[PDB]
């Protein structure tokens, strides 16, 4: 295959790395190699950039596809079922370390959706329905908040009768009925006081 002497390592968004052929392959192009979660993916392409498409198959016959944008600022990882056509998951990582990951149900609807900000905090949506509603959970540096999702806004709440909420809408609004690095406040138990 490709190793330390016959390739060059290229850093990709999402802390992935890809190896590229030295000069050129047998029939014109450059060869690409990237290992993602125990599974190494093979791909051919021109450009010698690190950009291109790499594919692979898991032990459970699931198909994996990894496309790297031309400017190398975006990464798309798709997992398909055995038919290579039913989408199981699709994750798009950006150069600024932010990402969106969609998980599809057996009908082809987004049933779970994870949004990772550049700071590392995550916004997780589970049990999404065709209504546009579901469960909402914000993962923070230290604690977890749990709440509900509506097609309108996102409400997160911590609970005596002193139980106040946290609202994030379609856009980047954040109203409270706050920090830019998303938090002074500290950890989970300590929210109930103020």
């Amino acid at each position: 295959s490709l190793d330390e002497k016959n390739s060059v390592s290229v850093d990709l968004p999402g802390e992935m790395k890809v190896l590229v052929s030295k000069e050129k392959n047998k029939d014109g192009k450059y060869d690409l190699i990237a290992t993602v979660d125990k599974l190494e993916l093979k791909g051919t392409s021109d450009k010698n950039n690190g950009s291109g498409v790499l594919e692979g198959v898991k032990a459970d016959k699931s198909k994996v596809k990894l496309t790297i944008s031309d400017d190398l600022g975006q990464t798309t990882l798709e997992v398909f079922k055995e038919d290579g056509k039913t989408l199981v998951s699709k994750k798009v990582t950006s150069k600024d370390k932010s990402s969106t990951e969609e998980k599809f149900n057996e009908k082809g609807e987004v049933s779970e959706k994870i949004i990772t900000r550049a700071d590392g905090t995550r916004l997780e949506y589970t049990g999404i329905k065709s209504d546009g509603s579901g469960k909402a959970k914000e993962v923070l540096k230290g604690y977890v908040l749990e709440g509900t999702l509506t097609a309108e806004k996102t409400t997160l709440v911590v609970k005596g009768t002193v139980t106040l909420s946290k609202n994030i809408s379609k856009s980047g609004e954040v109203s409270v009925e706050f920090t830019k690095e998303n938090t002074e406040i500290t950890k989970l138990d300590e929210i109930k006081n103020a």
């Epitope: 056509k85 039913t86 989408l87 969609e102 599809f104 009908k107 082809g108 609807e109």
Partner: antibody, heavy 121, light 107 residues
Framework: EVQLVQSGAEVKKPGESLKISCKGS????????IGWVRQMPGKGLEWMGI????????RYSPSFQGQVTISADKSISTAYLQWSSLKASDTAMYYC??????????????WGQGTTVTVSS | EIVLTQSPATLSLSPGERATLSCRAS??????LAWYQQKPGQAPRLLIY???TRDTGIPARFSGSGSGTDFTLTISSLEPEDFAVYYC????????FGQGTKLEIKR
């Protein structure tokens, strides 16, 4: 070996009801959406709607909502397209096709051979 | 609504030549664009989905590219059986098909 076979050509009169059928072979019929597509004589293709035969979840295009009923018999891998009162303007070719994805979309990858419906007095 | 526009309405070429077909969307849209071929008296056949991946059995001379607003179907060198109507279809607007491009023989 993956295929969809539609019922034969129909010559009907206006007002009559009609139910045409689409049978799947070679794959898990209840694991995929089945869609219906219209092509009027000399015209392009029109997406009408889809059904998930696993639980008969049905989604219609706003252009065809209330004009047709799409149904499915999960136990014999058959989807159906029906009218209760045919119009002359319903004269067209109708295709069923396997529809890939709701919140993603990979196109319609398997097609029936089509069914001609002629509606005349 | 998001509207698809295929250009040109009629593309007149000959076997051996390169063919480029355009689909443009009135707004920036996702990659979920599919291309179909339909010959007279036949059912449509899927050629490309997700803008750039070829369906099973489709010959290598067909390829798709594009993003945002501009999408292209390219036929590297036309064969006689490639002369047909071509349709695009996107996820938006309830999976609406484009109006179609007729690829005819130039004489």
């Amino acid at each position: 070996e993956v295929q969809l076979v539609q019922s034969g050509a129909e010559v009907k009169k206006p007002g009559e009801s009609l139910k045409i059928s689409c049978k799947g072979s070679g794959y898990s019929f209840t694991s995929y959406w089945i869609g219906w597509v219209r092509q009027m004589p000399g015209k392009g293709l029109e997406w009408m709607g889809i059904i998930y035969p696993g639980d008969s979840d049905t989604r219609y295009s706003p252009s065809f909502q209330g004009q047709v009923t799409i149904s499915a018999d999960k136990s014999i891998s058959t989807a159906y397209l029906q009218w209760s009162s045919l119009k002359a303007s319903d004269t067209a070719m109708y295709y069923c096709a396997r529809h890939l994805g709701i919140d993603y979309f990979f196109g319609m990858d398997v097609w029936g051979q089509g069914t001609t419906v002629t509606v005349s007095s | 609504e998001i509207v698809l526009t295929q250009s040109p309405a009629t593309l007149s070429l000959s076997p051996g030549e390169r063919a480029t077909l355009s689909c443009r969307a009135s707004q920036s849209v996702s990659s979920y664009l599919a291309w179909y071929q339909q010959k007279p008296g036949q059912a449509p056949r899927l050629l490309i989905y997700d803008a750039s991946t070829r369906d099973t059995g489709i010959p290598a001379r067909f390829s798709g590219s594009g993003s945002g607003t501009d999408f292209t179907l390219t036929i590297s060198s036309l064969e006689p059986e490639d002369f047909a109507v071509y349709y695009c279809q996107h996820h938006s607007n309830w999976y609406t098909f484009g109006q179609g491009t007729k690829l005819e023989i130039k004489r």
